[model samples]
Target: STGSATTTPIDSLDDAYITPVQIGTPAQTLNLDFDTGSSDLWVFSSETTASEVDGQTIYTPSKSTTAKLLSGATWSISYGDGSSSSGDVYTDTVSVGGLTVTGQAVESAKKVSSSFTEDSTIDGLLGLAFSTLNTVSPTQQKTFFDNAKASLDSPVFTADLGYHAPGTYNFGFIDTTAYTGSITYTAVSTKQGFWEWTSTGYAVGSGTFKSTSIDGIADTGTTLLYLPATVVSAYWAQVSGAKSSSSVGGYVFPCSATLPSFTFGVGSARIVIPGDYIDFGPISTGSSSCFGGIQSSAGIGINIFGDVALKAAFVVFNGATTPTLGFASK
Candidate 1:
């Protein structure tokens, strides 16, 4: 079987993407960020403290007859950005697009950090990276994608993130028309619990391609593209007035800087990120300088191809026993 769901960016910056998911017998729909960086299907719910909740929608498992508490099952998770949430677990009938899964673990948040509460656009996260990354104790739960893969026509799911418009996350089959060329396949390293892959090389703008392999994870949960310090410096060096500011904590330049495009390779194919996609908008409201979409991953300890990079191409997360990743220009 196959399923498809539309994912929409939260705001002007495309800070995060949200997809609607149905939980429970009566279908309590909540908009969730489909993060391929983590493996926990968590949501804000009636179990969450009132003060911690804002205008964002919350899933009330009690309202659903299909909800069943997983005795002694509790979970807590944190991200690189320091945002976090802890919750209780329940098994319920969950559906995405037209695909349904009964007895799916639905983590109901008991407490959420301010960062989550401030983002009124998303209710929670639906992780798709790998089940091995699940944080639940007693018995590690499977990710929504993991549980549905066995029944999928093919053990794969595709992520088609967009710049400022809506995109689709397709399960079971690839939509050949969604991309312009043949896909380039590459090996994936699942030991890290991420869609980790190695890029064959890179090029800045129309410059010569560098023959160097760069290892990184395709993380939809992250907002910016982070690469080696050398690559980031090389790109910014071409921009006039570009500097790494201590205050901004990232490289920035005059808002009008004519940024060069960035290109990364997957096997034999190359995906080009437009210059405009690198302009992450003004550093602040009405500020004259703009923050760059690409930053140094030196401090992060690992390179990350976040939304800024992923949106430039079509991505396939193959979940077969011998998994692999596919990239194609769109």
Candidate 2:
């Protein structure tokens, strides 16, 4: 399915933030997290007066050359991190690159907490990932894809993420420059957003096993994947002398040697992640962990596949049409 397709790589601002399409130009910019766990386009603004909001980027429509406040409705949002903000809803012209989508719904919050207010590189999070957790209104609220659907050269947006690499996440279409023309595509369920999926089975290292597969969800908003403790322990066995150390938050290990490659069982498809992508983080001064791509969070209701998994695969959100999830090469 190749044609003269067009792709746009988001401009990454250091490793801190990536510049997202401004809601209705006038050159107003919003920092986006490029999250996959949820779907919603929200922003913190100077208008919200709440004191609990922190590290949030405030959007001031009045200051932008093209900022337009939604007539009368107000907007508010809550994050999984237990933080929330509220503001007024507005319709304005928003653009990602040369493509502009007009009259999109946006929330401009005035109050913010220290976590959101103190952050310098990011102003707000643009949730490009699929999720049933979307908070958009029933009537006029539009998604990033809802508005961009009409303008996108293709009805698809691709994410190319690199592991701890400077400015690794990019949007638009899949860039083939990184691979050798061989990429795997996994079909996902469109029943609901959030990239809700069921694993075909489970495995550790090269050993494949048939068992009750786990139902899981992939989220880019989270940094690490939460797996059952038993699963995590089993995963570590594949690594040589990978005894757990508490220095790196529960499971730090000696980084004196290279780790083994780990693979995930996803619907009959075996997805492998490089060992470097797993234990490369400088959790402490000299120690790193196996990272196994799976941590212990079995009782938390659902497992979250985090950035560790995403950095290894190409993800596509088809919110414009059937709301399908597409996965390809890393």
Candidate 3:
């Protein structure tokens, strides 16, 4: 969905909360969600027109007493799902964890759509994925990282997800406590931002799975994973009793069996898509079959392996060392 306008009211979630801290300062309490899909900091503004905002968390500049706005620049962004928001720019004392960074760049949207105004369930988004997709251009605008880099205790910061019910999401130095062994690191390619990647080939169960190799990029921002038509069709071909379903426009198969597992070779990193994601079910469409996943793009220059794939790996963005991204098991 693109260019679609919505006015869904934003609903508040008691569990969604965060604290952003800069180096050597108290944490700035925030209501935020951890979005790996895109890199940007967005917050609702109290000054925003009430009628324009649904149920989103509204940030009142007056309340901060230390907030500042970038009067000259206005920002507007649209997501792949047709959600969009528009707002002004600002810089202010920001904190996450115990780290405090002064002049942290932030966006305050005055106008927002219902989709974003609704599903987000929080006032704003803090994209810890990558700097390349940053809404604030390095040349024209400064990013939250640019200011905190100098003050951060380590060259890196870590995000700890509080999966606990009513759990709190924490952002700070990578807590080594979660692992027993050393965490590996990989160099990030800075050519283009957004965790751009290359795949060697696609395979399932240690065997040749497809006629041709499938290639694509891994994005944390997206929820659905998409593959090229050729690879998708080939994958369906592997199913024992695959059939077409018109409802979702994909092949459907029995989920009871141990389906093949496809692995994506990312240089040193390997992403595995389990068989469960391949099983099918009945569809509302006239076709009786539905694919666990379907082919959406054909011969597209890029295939986006979204959050479903990345969630299985621990990703590290080493902008401090160089433009490189390292991946390891969580």
Candidate 4:
């Protein structure tokens, strides 16, 4: 049977899509962000200082009979957005959807940055990237997907992220009904512990497609699409009144500006991001200024096909034999 699960988006933070997970005995439920960009199953827990807890749901290890400390093991993680968390480790039963993983390493956060504390809704992150990227020290930890893939009917999972709507993450199987048209498959390089691949090229609006390749990863955790500075500049140039603003921290344009859609090439498949998606709301509440969702990947070293890009298509992360990525227009 195909083990699958559906995830609902947090209506407030339209930036992230979260899924419900059960951890430890008797099942304590936590809403977690399923991140394919990093490898670590960490959560805000009782170990965290009271001041750092904020409004997040905490996982209490003592309440779970099956929970066991990893004895001196520790973990720390920093995200591209400057959010970070670090803490001790515990072995516990972790379940996602209908699949249960025994003795899974669950990182309980003892310290969290203000970025995380302020966003109290997200309790933790479930990393779906390669296990090699796991941050636990002394011994690396396997992710929920890695630990349960062997028992799955097929070593695969699909991300059906909706635009400002609900989406489902299906494990161990692919649902053809979720996507229309043929799936365009591309080879992925796992050397970086990410689903890293190169897009043949891209174009702005209805312009001719360029052949320059852009190396990047399909990161579900990231909220915006990040490309090379040059590419980002070219795309924004097509939009009248768009400018890079230091105070706004990215490209900002007039709210009424006519924006052009951006397109990326995966093999021969052309995935186009609508212009509306590029306008990432306002720079601030009650402001006529708007921030562009597509930004520069200057310091990041690699481009990121974040939720902004993923939500444009139905994505398949295939783990059998050589890892490959499949994409299709929703």
Candidate 5:
């Protein structure tokens, strides 16, 4: 069966898009970040220590008749930014849009990092990456999409992220009306549990496109567009009053400065990121400086096309035998 869910921006963070997901027998609705960079469905839960929960919603498995604990099982995950979570495991009914997956593995958090605990709006994460990346120990767990793919009309999903606006994540089908013009297709290398692709080159403003091939992943869970340090340096050089700030931990520039558009090649297609989008708003309220949405991926090695890049196009995560990514203007 096909399904669709509305996705909304997380305040002014422009960091992630959250969507509604229903879990348990009676359906406990929660707002989750549909993360393509990860593969575990972990949520804040009753099992978590009260002090570590903050203002986030917690899922109580005991209240759900269909919930079954996977005794002796546990999971822990750490992110590049040092955010982490660990928990017990349970099997329950999980639904998204109109599709339901019975006996879905639900990781109930016993402990959450300050990053997660402080975010009251996000209940958990719905990972859409390859199931091989799931963190469940002893026995690996399948993602909601993986478990439901067998019964889908077409094993595919589309991400239609908007700029500071409402978007949609559609399953088992693609809505032609959501995008414009022809969709450019590119081969995806999923060997690393990511939708990894190579960019032929990139350019700033109307300058000559550099032939520097960059390998990166399309990650919905990440906020900024991370690129090679040299590439980041070149892009920022065009902007006046821009400098790498240790306090800000990235490149920052005067908020009033005019920034140049950044464009990168995907196969034969040239995807453009507007200059305005690159300025990830002011560093703080009433601040004269702003953080660049595109940063260096030096420590991480692998570059990431995060929310800033994804929102500019309609992305199709094709789950066919030989998976491919389809991008179109929105």
Candidate 6:
């Protein structure tokens, strides 16, 4: 009826978030990135090129009696960061936390990008976005959430992301005590296949809330907060010596520089990302110039409220009759 999972930051920098998932009849457990930005539940598997597999846990579908090949079905997905994976499809029993989904489409990766092989922390991705974004072709597949929601008491999930600590993700029902105040609800546009919503306004440090609507998606998959150039420029200007660097490829400043907290309004609810989160870390191994967690999304087309911003609030990704997003201070 319901399920919950504990997700941990894979590294000290909070670069990747990983949660355990059980796949197949024998139930091989693997660590996967819970990504709301994409819509394909793909994993590194026996079908993947042996050379492309890192030390990640790979799903051996052949070992599971319940695994059945999805004839003629194929899937391929690429991210905003240019990382990609393509694979054949299979129908298997998939479980997240305590909730189970039968006949769930489990994509087995046959090819993966270089980035995926180098990253040993995540075995694959568990897509939580709308099923419309699924990459499986010839016959598109539904995501784990989409398949499970039908049997869940309530077709809603909440992401309680943490900073430098373990966070909890809940399905079916909202844990009222997980957040402090009432949720600020906003309409979401599902046509884009993202939990896209518009923010009422934003503020830098103790500055006034500038009345402006900022459109972005609640992408738990992304690691940084990407905003329009105008908003990004305003935030960096407050930090001493902060500048957009060519080589480092983003706004960077002295690690010793004071980073002002960033605040964004959801409906009338204002969520604040502390200055510490914005400090990110040094550019290189020991470079004093730290990369800013908030970056410009000029060329990216759409703004992204990634983990950096999501960690500041309890986000409810409502998949009701009409999709909506809710935010609350925690």
lDDT per prediction?
0.93, 0.58, 0.53, 0.90, 0.90, 0.94
Sort order, lDDT high to low: 6, 1, 5, 4, 2, 3
Q: Where does candidate 4 stray beyond 4 Å? A: 11-13
Model 5, 1-330: lDDT tens digits are 988999999887677788999999788988999999999999999999898888877899999999999988899999878999999999999988988999999999999999998889899999999999999998999999999998888999989887878899999998999888878888899999998888888999999989878999988899889999999999999999999999889999999999999998877787888898887878988999988989999999799989888988899999998888888877
> Per-residue lDDT tens digits of candidate 6, residues 1-330?
999999999999888799999999899999999999999999999999999998989999999999999999999999999999999999999988899999999999999999999999899999999999999989999989899988998999999988999998999999999999799999999989999999998999999999799999999999999999999999999998999998989999999887899999998889999998887798989989899999999999999999999999999999999989999999
Candidates in order, TM-scores: namely 0.99, 0.77, 0.71, 0.97, 0.97, 0.99
1 or 4: which has the higher lDDT?
A: 1
| Cα lDDT of model 3 by residue, 1-330, tens digit | 001011111222112234432311223455565455556677777756677667655666655656776667676667655777777877777655444556666777777777666544566766665565676532245445555666555555442222211222223245555433445554444455555555556665567633344445555445445777666666667777865556655556765545676666655446566655433344444544444644445434457765445444455545475645555555
Q: Candidate 5: list runs displaced more than 4 Å.
A: none
| Best model per lDDT | 6
Instruction: Evaluate residue 43 in candidate 2 and report its C-alpha lDDT on the 0 to 100 scale.
Output: 76
Give all candidate RMSDs, comma-separated. 0.8, 4.7, 7.4, 1.3, 1.1, 0.7
Question: Candidate 3's C-alpha lDDT?
Answer: 0.53
Question: Stretches of candidate 1 above 4 Å error?
Answer: none
Candidate 4 TM-score, C-alpha based? 0.97
User: With candidate 1 superimposed using the best TM-score fit, by how many Å does residue 264's alpha carbon deviate from the native?
Assistant: 0.3
Compose the digit string of candidate 2's lDDT tens values, residues 1-330: 211212222232112235555655456766666566656666766676656446555667777665665666665567655666556676777665455667766666655556666555556666655434556444446566556665555676665566555323333455566544355444566454566666555566557664556666777666666666776777777767666655544454456656555566655556677666566344544544433345666556676667666667766655555655555655
Model 3 Cα shift for residue 82 (angstroms): 2.6
- By TM-score, the better pick of 2 and 3 is 2
Provide backbone clash counts, one per model: 0, 37, 29, 0, 0, 0
Residues 1-330 of candidate 1: C-alpha lDDT, one tens digit per residue: 888999999998888999999999899999999999999999999999999999889898879999999999999999988999998999999998888888999999999999999999999999998899999998999998888989999999999999998999999999999998899999999989999999998899999999789999999999999999999998898889999998999999999889999999998789999988888888889999999999999978889999999999999999999899999999
lDDT of 6: 0.94
Q: Candidate 4 on 5-67: residue-level lDDT in tens? A: 667776633588888889988899988999999999999999997898888888999999999
